Amino acid sequence: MQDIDLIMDIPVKLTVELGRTRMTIKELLRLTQGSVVALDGLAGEPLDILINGYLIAQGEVVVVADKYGVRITDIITPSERMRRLSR
Amino acid sequence: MQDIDLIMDIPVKLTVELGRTRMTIKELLRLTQGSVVALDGLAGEPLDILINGYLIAQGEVVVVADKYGVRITDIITPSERMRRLSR
Amino acid sequence: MQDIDLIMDIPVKLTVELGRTRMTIKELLRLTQGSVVALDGLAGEPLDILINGYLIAQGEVVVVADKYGVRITDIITPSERMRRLSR
Amino acid sequence: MQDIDLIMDIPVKLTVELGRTRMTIKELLRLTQGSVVALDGLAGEPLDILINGYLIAQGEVVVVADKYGVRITDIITPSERMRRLSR
Amino acid sequence: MQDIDLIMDIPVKLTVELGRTRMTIKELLRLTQGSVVALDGLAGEPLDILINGYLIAQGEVVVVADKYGVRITDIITPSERMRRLSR
Amino acid sequence: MQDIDLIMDIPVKLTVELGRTRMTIKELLRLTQGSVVALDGLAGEPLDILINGYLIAQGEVVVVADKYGVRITDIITPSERMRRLSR
Amino acid sequence: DIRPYDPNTQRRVVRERLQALEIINERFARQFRMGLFNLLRRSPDITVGAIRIQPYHEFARNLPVPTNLNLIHLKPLRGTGLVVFSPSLVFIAVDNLFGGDGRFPTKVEGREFTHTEQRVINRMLKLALEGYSDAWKAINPLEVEYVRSEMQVKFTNITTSPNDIVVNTPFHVEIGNLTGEFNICLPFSMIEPLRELLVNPPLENSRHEDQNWRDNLVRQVQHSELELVANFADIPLRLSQILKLKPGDVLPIEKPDRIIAHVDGVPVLTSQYGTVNGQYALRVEHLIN
Amino acid sequence: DIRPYDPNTQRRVVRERLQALEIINERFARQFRMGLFNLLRRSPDITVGAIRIQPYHEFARNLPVPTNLNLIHLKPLRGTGLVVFSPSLVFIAVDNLFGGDGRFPTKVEGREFTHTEQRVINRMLKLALEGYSDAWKAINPLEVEYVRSEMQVKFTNITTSPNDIVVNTPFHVEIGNLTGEFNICLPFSMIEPLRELLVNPPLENSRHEDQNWRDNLVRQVQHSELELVANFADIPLRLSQILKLKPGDVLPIEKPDRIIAHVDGVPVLTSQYGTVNGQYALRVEHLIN
């Protein structure tokens, strides 16, 4: 509608997250330069795409001539979103 | 539509601006504690309302029992928006 | 230094923000002429002062003979800035 | 008309802009002699042509026997002008 | 026409000149603070109005509530323009 | 020096400008005989003094027995000149 | 609930009880009673008035004109304190020091204090300063240094704004029919860092025990848990594009030289992505400091 | 709103309250009261008149003829200040210094001051100068140096134009039925650089704190953002050509040896265009200074 066009003039910010993990503060203090930290996500899984910190879609990492890119694959339809938030 | 409902779940940020002004850096350095700085806007003029830094409407300042509030009065329809951006 | 003097000749823009709030787009559509919108900030709190959209200090609202003014009170030293950005 | 002829006797000034970019003042201070600064525009894009600071047309860069020249290609018709100003 | 409307969106600059005179550089060096310099124009004569340094009309000086104003009186039709340029 | 004396023999032209303003061509066409046009400058402000179209000093308007005169007051030192050209 | 905003209006800030400040005031009252009895050769009666929290202008408007105002600094805290002596108390002290019996009631003058009266005020001020310093020492080390004496709010601006919150503790001195009063005013910002110390009642010193308590608290908190999130990169886009996200859509992003690790939106370090043990890894480079 | 212009007319400039100037005037009044009591052996009463802002000619027309005018310089500020002594005050001082009781009313003379009266005026002037210097020292270091004494506006032109704005602070001196008056006049341009210091009320010294405040303000502003625009070249043309801009139209331009970088119309440096990383680049050469 016309208000969709009005908010179209408003820029927004997109965020791509590689993964997430949980650990104690003591473990973080144990970490030093060159330390290795694992993530919950596996290899080849689509990465989360966030708009102002809200996940809306998923994509795959590509490189464009010198720049990283995300190839959108799937959405976060309410059933899947509720399932992943329940975790 | 359904995508309007989808983006409804996405929170946004609103910004209220009292006014704007222009000055040199030397004048800013001259400013000290307790200094007085004027603004382009006059008294009683509606204040700008910004969504993620984009002006969408104007309102008037009110106080709600202990908290400031903005009473929306007018919009920033494209003619007025272009006129005020041309300034 | 001399480069401080050089950039002094360069004018900058100052922005004063009354407050901020978050709401859904559906709530904004529900809003009409004369609607009342609340803000996160309370009454009497110092207002944010922004230079090109970056907060650098806080002040209090005064009126100069017919014109609004801001009476600077405090700064946004890195500890407080990080604390308020974490919110 | 006759007033078009009258203003024809009045000379005007034309400005050609290679490109535009945005950066912080701190980054500018970091810049030294021989520093490299990028621009938003890409390679081969038509350059903006400005009359007294107002964009009216676009052209392509050519060299005339020892002197640079602009080969006009397109106009800034209101739809495109509004689209590029919205950016 | 439509191009008149297009150039209407282009702002222009207007210049009002009180008068003109000719003197040697030695006389200018003789001039000090508070010195008196005469002009060719007489008292009550219409002042020249220039657009980007080109004379197009003449007017009379008025004051608007605190601001000087020019009350347009006559034009610079080609016969008069040639006559005054021949001087 | 001796070349200052040589150029002293060369006469120059001085220009006094009452004020300046900006308007559209359509507004100028709307103007008729007896129309009132405002200027950016206020009442009592020193007028610009131009040598061959270059501002070098400011003065105040006086009348000498039947002839207008300019009473020089201040200069256009580079800081003020840059500040007023930035406008 | 909805009210119109007035820039010339301000609200209050609940209650800020300072039991330690009251204890310091009582100790200073005892010391000053002893000092005044020593000085004037007569036994005074000092009553500690209720501690008052009010804007600076409200305190200023209640001060009789002229009044003796003394500027003091409570080192190492930053600010300027004020000691207020009413003209009646100064007149009583002058009368007592010069053999006056106090039978004659004091006459309103509204005149600047004489240099002899200035010396009387200084004699009172030194003892008051010693007493207050000793009283404050019981809870926290402080040094009081007098700056200058003024007779009007014109010579004030101890505070940046007239509406700034200040703490005023009145004291009433009685050596007979006399009921003289002196006040101590301190800006709230000066005592703001020591708010925790002044609010809760003091306990026994046990400085080593308190240090051990803090060490144990630090040790226990070290085993707490959080969530570490690393943002790969960010993209500026528009909502219309978001409405058109489909499989296979490629969005260009800027290549991040370093990966910044954030904890609840708080950056903690910058690293680089890697592949170790079949999972993504971050090679820590520098901590955010 | 529309009015006809008259070159012999001028307007006013709002209000320019100087609280610091009033405080300096009060301190100078105290010092001068002490000095006059020391000199004339009688207690004077000095009242500070309201500070006045008016054109120079308006101040000149109110001065009785003849009057004692003294030229002073407030170093390091550039200009010439004036100290105005009314003939009545000089006559009162002469009468007091020579045993006159003041019973006889003063007679209008309109005559030049005698050299003895000149020495009386100099004796007053030295004390006034010391007092005013001491008063100004409290807020900013200044030195006052007397230049010469004149008895008419003929010998003036402290100001370039008669309509220049000056600041006049009257003072009323009373040592009985006498109500003598002296004035201090200063051009506005002399105190223009110190306008910020004089307008807002002074605070505590805290010079190190103020320097730290300025340093923090500088540091925070250093992270601000702007827009950098480089103009390739400029062309002089006409509007008729602009109406005929079409695809393929070639317009000759002068080859720029250097590319000037402007920020909101403010040149900052000159550079040369280049092609680096597939995008246009500017090799910075010299900064605009």
C-alpha pair distances (Å), H177 with each of A70, H91, H105: 94, 14, 10
- C-alpha H47/C-alpha H88 separation (Å) is 16
Interchain proximity G237–A11, CB inside 8 Å = yes
Chain G CB contacts of A43 under 8 Å are 275, 278-280
* Cis before C78 (ω within 30): no
Helix (H, G, I), strand (E, B) or coil at H105: coil
Angle at which helix H115-137 crosses helix H87-97, to 10 degrees, equals 110
Chain F CB contacts of E18 under 8 Å are 16-18, 47, 61, 68, 70
Interchain proximity C73–G161, CB inside 8 Å = yes
Phi, psi of D2 (to 5 degrees): -70, -35
Specify the amino acid at residue G52: R
CA B80 to chain centre: 15
User: How far does E44 lie from chain D, in Å, by closest CA?
Assistant: 27
Search chain B and give the residue with CA nearest G245.
B3
Search chain B and give the residue with CA nearest C42.
B67
- C-alpha E19/C-alpha F14 separation (Å) is 9
User: How far does B3 lie from chain A, in Å, by closest CA?
Assistant: 10
Can you point out the beta strands (E) in chain G? 2-4, 45-48, 52-55, 68-75, 81-85, 143-150, 165-174, 180-187, 225-238, 249-252, 259-263, 266-276, 279-287
For residue G91, give the DSSP letter.
H
C-alpha closest to that of A50 among A16, A81, A2: A16
Interchain proximity A52–B13, CB inside 8 Å = yes
**Of F36, F60, F86, Cβ closest to residue H266:** F86
Search chain C and give the residue with CA nearest F82.
C9
Search chain C and give the residue with CA nearest D32.
C3
Residue G13 near residue G167 (C-beta atoms within 8 A): no
CA A9 to chain centre: 24
Sign, CA torsion D33/D36/D37/D42:
positive
User: How far does B23 lie from chain G, in Å, by closest CA?
Assistant: 24
Residue H183 near residue H54 (C-beta atoms within 8 A): no
**Of G10, G160, G265, Cβ closest to residue C44:** G10
Chains contacting F (3+ CB pairs below 8 angstroms) = C, E, H
What letters, b where the CB count within 10 A reaches 16 and e where it falls short, cover B26-43? bebeebebbbbbebebee
Sign, CA torsion G122/G124/G125/G127:
positive
Interchain proximity E13–D51, CB inside 8 Å = no
Burial of H151 (0-12, 13-18, 19+ CB in 10 A): middle
Residue C51 near residue B24 (C-beta atoms within 8 A): no
User: How far does H147 lie from chain E, in Å, by closest CA?
Assistant: 21
Search chain F and give the residue with CA nearest H9.
F44
For residue C86, give the DSSP letter.
H
Token digits for B56? Answer: 């969408």
Element (H, E) at G18: none
User: How far does G244 lie from chain B, in Å, by closest CA?
Assistant: 10
C-alpha pair distances (Å), B62 with each of B14, C28, D63, E65: 17, 18, 62, 34
**Inter-chain contacts counted by CB atoms under 8 A, chains A and B:** 23
- C-alpha G40/C-alpha D70 separation (Å) is 97
User: How far does A7 lie from chain G, in Å, by closest CA?
Assistant: 7
- C-alpha G114/C-alpha G192 separation (Å) is 37
Deposited experimental method: cryo-EM
Which residues have C-beta within 8 Å of that of residue E87, sequence separation ≥ 6?
none
Interchain proximity F86–H160, CB inside 8 Å = no
Residue F33 near residue E4 (C-beta atoms within 8 A): no
**Inter-chain contacts counted by CB atoms under 8 A, chains B and C:** 152
- C-alpha E70/C-alpha C71 separation (Å) is 40
What is the structure's resolution, reported in angstroms to one decimal? 5.9
Residue D18 near residue H280 (C-beta atoms within 8 A): yes
Interchain proximity C57–H287, CB inside 8 Å = no
- Sole residue written with tokens 């308590």: G213
Chains F and G touch (3+ CB pairs under 8 A): no
Helix (H, G, I), strand (E, B) or coil at H22: helix
- C-alpha G196/C-alpha G201 separation (Å) is 10
Chains C and H touch (3+ CB pairs under 8 A): yes
Residue G203 neighbours by CB distance under 10 Å = 8
Angle at which helix H19-40 crosses helix H115-137, to 10 degrees, equals 140
**Of E3, E7, E62, Cβ closest to residue H3:** E62
Chain H CB contacts of F38 under 8 Å are none
- C-alpha C58/C-alpha C44 separation (Å) is 12
Chain B CB contacts of A56 under 8 Å are 6, 10
Which residues have C-beta within 8 Å of that of residue B81, sequence separation ≥ 6?
B55
Which residues have C-beta within 8 Å of that of residue H199, sequence separation ≥ 6?
B36, H16, H17, H18, H19, H20
Interchain proximity F82–C9, CB inside 8 Å = yes
Phi, psi of F46 (to 5 degrees): -60, 145
Element (H, E) at H257: none
Residue E8 near residue F47 (C-beta atoms within 8 A): no
Chain A CB contacts of G279 under 8 Å are 38-39, 41-43
- Sole residue written with tokens 């500018």: D28
For chain A, what is the HEC assignment? CHHHHHHHCCEEEEEEEEEEEEEEHHHHHHCCCCCCCCCCCCCCCCEEEEECCEEEEEEEEEEECCEEEEEEEEECCHHHHHHHHHC
Residue D20 near residue D40 (C-beta atoms within 8 A): yes
Residue C12 near residue H274 (C-beta atoms within 8 A): no
C-alpha pair distances (Å), E61 with each of E38, G71, H2: 19, 59, 10
For chain B, what is the HEC assignment? CHHHHHHHCCCEEEEEEEEEEEEEHHHHHHCCCCCEEECCCCCCCCEEEEECCEEEEEEEEEEECCEEEEEEEEECCHHHHHHHHHC
Interchain proximity D25–C7, CB inside 8 Å = yes
Residue in D9, D10, D14, D56 to test binding to E, most E beta-carbons within 10 Å: D10
